[PDB]
Amino acid sequence: MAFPSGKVEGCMVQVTCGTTTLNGLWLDDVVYCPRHVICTSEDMLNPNYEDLLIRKSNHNFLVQAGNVQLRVIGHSMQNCVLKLKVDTANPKTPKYKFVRIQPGQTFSVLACYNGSPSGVYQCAMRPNFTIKGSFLNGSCGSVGFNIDYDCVSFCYMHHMELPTGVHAGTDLEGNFYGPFVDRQT
Ligand SMILES: Cn1cnc(Cn2c(=O)nc(Nc3cc4cn(C)nc4cc3Cl)n(Cc3cc(F)c(F)cc3F)c2=O)n1
């Protein structure tokens, strides 16, 4: 039962900080993405995110909507998500809300790679707050949603695959579902 993905496809962007790259969600004039993007490969195992944040400037972020670069004019960190303020509002922004779902609820996921939509499928949140998704490498920042009439409810931002092959992430305010932390361990 996956929801049609057209309204979300127009919101996906590629976010690059140095050589680390993942997917971002562009709504109005804000891009949301996992804060993990500010890690170099050596920081990924045990990042000090407050320190890494101090060291970055707006011009260290490259945001691409397709072949169009968007100018970053502000950035801030909210729990495990980074919010990049860009100088252009997304003209395909749908009506949307952010919601936090519970175990047992289902949602659709738009898997993206390097900012480009790749597939859509339905998932359920398990009681241990993991999901059995279909995510490959490069899918970090892909989002889960439901459609509520005309309104897109965003409920899941993908961060990591765990050793057993299931997946974990945050709501759109950056709070993990479950007892996980955004580090490569
Ligand atoms: C197999 N699989 C299924 N889902 C995933 C999701 N995922 C991902 O796509 N990427 C990750 N690490 C990165 C490596 C990078 C190399 N470059 C050049 N840029 C990169 C950017 C990322 Cl995000 N990871 C690992 C991971 C991502 C996190 F956000 C986190 F907090 C901890 C982690 F261990 C990953 O799971 N891969």
Side-chain angles (χ1 to χ4, degrees), residues 19 21 36 135-136 138-140 158-161 182-184:
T19 49
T21 315
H36 204 62
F135 292 122
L136 302 182
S139 60
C140 192
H158 180 47
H159 288 243
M160 51 187 25
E161 177 171 295
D182 50 342
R183 78 161 101 111
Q184 211 182 227

Side-chain angles (χ1 to χ4, degrees), residues 9-38:
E9 290 171 47
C11 296
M12 314 294 302
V13 300
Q14 168 173 214
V15 179
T16 296
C17 181
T19 49
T20 306
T21 315
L22 42 61
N23 301 285
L25 179 69
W26 180 26
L27 300 168
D28 298 314
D29 59 1
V30 175
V31 173
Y32 304 80
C33 66
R35 66 181 178 169
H36 204 62
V37 74
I38 65 180

Side-chain angles (χ1 to χ4, degrees), residues 12-67:
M12 314 294 302
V13 300
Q14 168 173 214
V15 179
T16 296
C17 181
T19 49
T20 306
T21 315
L22 42 61
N23 301 285
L25 179 69
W26 180 26
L27 300 168
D28 298 314
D29 59 1
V30 175
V31 173
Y32 304 80
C33 66
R35 66 181 178 169
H36 204 62
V37 74
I38 65 180
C39 295
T40 72
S41 324
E42 82 178 271
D43 304 302
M44 277 164 197
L45 309 89
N46 180 236
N48 170 10
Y49 282 109
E50 302 284 340
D51 181 48
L52 295 166
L53 183 65
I54 291 330
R55 293 164 144 63
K56 315 283 173 170
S57 302
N58 292 330
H59 62 270
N60 290 123
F61 298 98
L62 176 66
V63 184
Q64 302 174 264
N67 323 287

